[PDB]
Write a protein that binds this ligand. Structure first.
Ligand SMILES: O=C1[C@H](c2ccc(Cl)cc2)CCCN1c1cncc2ccccc12
Ligand SMILES: O=C1[C@H](c2ccc(Cl)cc2)CCCN1c1cncc2ccccc12
Ligand SMILES: [Cl-]
Ligand SMILES: [Cl-]
Lengths: 305, 300
């Protein structure tokens, strides 16, 4: 019993974090085999950030302009290249702690663990979700750039996020490990803002199933609805549309609890229109949307890595 | 910016988790140097739990009755002893991944990271607090016994909890790493029930200071309170009494934000009275009590 915001064990990722220094800027790098990946903005001064020509700024840097430190050991940079918004620093030593890994680009609604790092040292791990507006509601301070997001799929670390910036509202923006930004964000000091966000409907439904698995049923009702009627309600309350794929993905949770997906949609519909009436669900007075259906199944079944 | 329930990186602890088997029962063990620590109830059957005599049950066991598996490698048990409610299995191999560590017994209100494990393999990490009723609201299933709670301030892992059981209300009870249970709990199947739980006042105050640091002041007011009037009101909402120690511990946060502890107490009193009025504080519609003053300073 119990239901917590649970992150993946971070050990396999901790053994990859390094400190990258370029001029006066120090941020984090991900050392996988003989390559250290980090945000390309590490080469920029504050003035450069206003209108950077990254190819031009990078051609001016040599290998010895990049100081990479792994623990109390300096790594020798022997090559440098850019892939989208990520800098790849070829180092003379392969990381002996390199885990089985892949670079995966996630979709909005998908959750992941963030290993927040400062000066190449892991400080904490937390679970978050890629918002529908492509930002993450992370917890990051100055020096956190280069911190990564990941999932573990069996024995393989799937790196899905690298931290690049904080937006004016305090939310965060970054790239996948191929350097492609999530969202319409750019690595330049210019006016940028998070778009209006919506609630991840399939995740709220998954969390309601987790509450039922954990013994909370007050929100259940005799009613059912259709996908079309429910999607009308979802649109009204800034909830993401629920697709037939979401319904299929919720099938296992529906079978385990005996509550049809559209039966749970009718509970959600009632919660949106009436509130909780002074009640809580899994210790929350708000509908939680940062647990996917797979996270609920994994936590309520005890999947190990 | 941002404020998340943040756990310590678990790598240093993952390299210590092992699987311990005794007869039909399999749970987790913590392998530190040449000793594997695990709940002594691993030596029991379900029928032994009503009134077990652990000394009598343990004297019947030999080293080869304990199977310890670290990864895909079997460790040889060469000694066994009991310390309070923890079994210490001396193994023939020291854990090469043993981190710099200490055993610390924590007080209610303290927080720690839990590395939930099954069959000696880590499944997830989450942040917990030792409740005033000495239970933890964990996320644990059958097979999670032996999973540990810890803090990692400055490269040293401070192990503070080892999971032993789930109580009838779904909350959890365990011991420190010396085998002393937190709370009036025993590793025996008996009516023990969690006592009525209360809110960790000093932690709610710390979290309100985190919200002020992060730019939220809507809940502040022009009032102050005496410490005693605060406690009289606070107890009426099942909040823990705030002591002078708690006031002293909140000093750094009070200095950083410029809000005196008793002025923050006045705001808490008003929040308890009025609710949030459709507003949130650091993404929460409830007053959060699982961040200590130290956690707020560490994160903000
Ligand atoms: O956002 C930035 C800066 C920046 C500015 C513009 C562009 Cl396009 C990219 C990056 C670089 C320094 C780190 N930083 C931060 C990143 N995360 C959390 C931060 C919390 C407080 C203060 C700064 C933070
Ligand atoms: O509480 C127990 C059992 C037990 C019984 C008596 C005594 Cl004295 C100690 C331990 C042993 C099996 C594991 N178990 C559990 C521990 N954590 C979460 C559990 C979630 C669901 C089901 C069982 C759980
Ligand atoms: Cl900069
Ligand atoms: Cl048992």
């Amino acid at each position: 019993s119990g239901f917590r915001k649970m992150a993946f064990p971070s050990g396999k990722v901790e053994g990859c974090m390094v400190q990258v220094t370029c001029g006066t800027t120090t941020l984090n790098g991900l050392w996988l085999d003989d390559v250290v990946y980090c945000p390309r903005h590490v080469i920029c001064t504050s003035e450069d950030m206003l209108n950077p020509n990254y190819e031009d700024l990078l051609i001016r840097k040599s290998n010895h302009n990049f100081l990479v430190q792994a623990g109390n050991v300096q790594l020798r940079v022997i090559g440098h290249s850019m892939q989208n918004c990520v800098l790849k620093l070829k180092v003379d030593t392969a990381n002996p702690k390199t885990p089985k890994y892949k670079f995966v680009r996630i979709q909005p609604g998908q959750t992941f663990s963030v290993l927040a790092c400062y000066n190449g040292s892991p400080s904490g791990v937390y679970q978050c979700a890629m918002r529908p507006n492509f930002t993450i509601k992370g917890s990051f301070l100055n020096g956190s750039c280069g911190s990564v997001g990941f999932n573990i799929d069996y024995d393989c670390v799937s790196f899905c996020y690298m931290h690049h910036m904080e937006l004016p509202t305090g939310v965060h923006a970054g790239t996948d490990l191929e350097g492609n930004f999530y969202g319409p964000f750019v690595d330049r000091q210019t006016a940028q803002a998070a778009g209006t966000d919506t609630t991840i409907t399939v995740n709220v439904l998954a969390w309601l199933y987790a509450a039922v698995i954990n013994g909370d049923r007050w929100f259940l009702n005799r009613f059912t609805t259709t996908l079309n009627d429910f999607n009308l309600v979802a649109m009204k309350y800034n909830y993401e549309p629920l697709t037939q794929d979401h319904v299929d993905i919720l099938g296992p949770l529906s079978a385990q609890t005996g509550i049809a997906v559209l039966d749970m949609c009718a509970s959600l519909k009632e919660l949106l229109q009436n509130g909780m009436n002074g009640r809580t669900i899994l210790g929350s007075a708000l509908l939680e949307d940062e647990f996917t259906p797979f996270d609920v199944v994994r936590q309520c079944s005890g999947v190990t890595f």
